[model samples]
Target: ETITAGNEDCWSKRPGWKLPDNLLTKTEFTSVDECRKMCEESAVEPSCYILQINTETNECYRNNEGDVTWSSLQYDQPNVVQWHLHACS
Candidate 1:
């Protein structure tokens, strides 16, 4: 038998989203690329697998504690985006 392994070190971005998980540190970024860099940097970390962006506030949110995860979610708000950063085992 064979089992397909999960992907590693990836960050997914949604066009318009609102992911309000507030367990991790709040980070600020000047551009989309820089915001993405923040998520990618934490992709390999054990607890930080997701990031929520609020462009209105120019802030990012993440959950850095036990058993956190997400799917292909989206939001229609203009000032928000959902990012999933993960490195599966």
Candidate 2:
């Protein structure tokens, strides 16, 4: 779990954290903002809460769970920006 949405805070940006399993979906290169929207629009079993953007491969990965279990430290790169949804309002 993460910070709840308040005052329009729907998401949190986490650097160096990536969800490596049970992905909701994966897409090719896109902007961070676009990846965020994809997560929001995705239809998954648990709902999209984890998002990984890899600048090296220009890929976007969406997952329902956080880094508490499904995480990869090896993929932690400066160019990669992880995102987590906080109960959208």
Question: Each prediction's TM-score against the native?
Answer: 0.51, 0.60
> In model 2, what are the clashing residue pairs, if there are any?
none
- Please name the candidate that would achieve the greatest lDDT relative to the true structure: 2
Q: Identify the runs in model 2 with alpha carbons over 4 angstroms from their true place.
A: 1-9, 21-24, 64-76
- Estimate, for each residue in 1-89, the C-alpha lDDT of model 1 and write its tens digit: 11112445556666576544545556666564565566656545555555666777767666565555334333686777666665555
- Any runs in candidate 1 off by more than 4 Å, and if so which? 1-8, 21-24, 28-46, 69-74
* Model 1 / residue 80 / CA error / Å: 0.3
Q: How close is candidate 2 to the true structure, as a TM-score?
A: 0.60
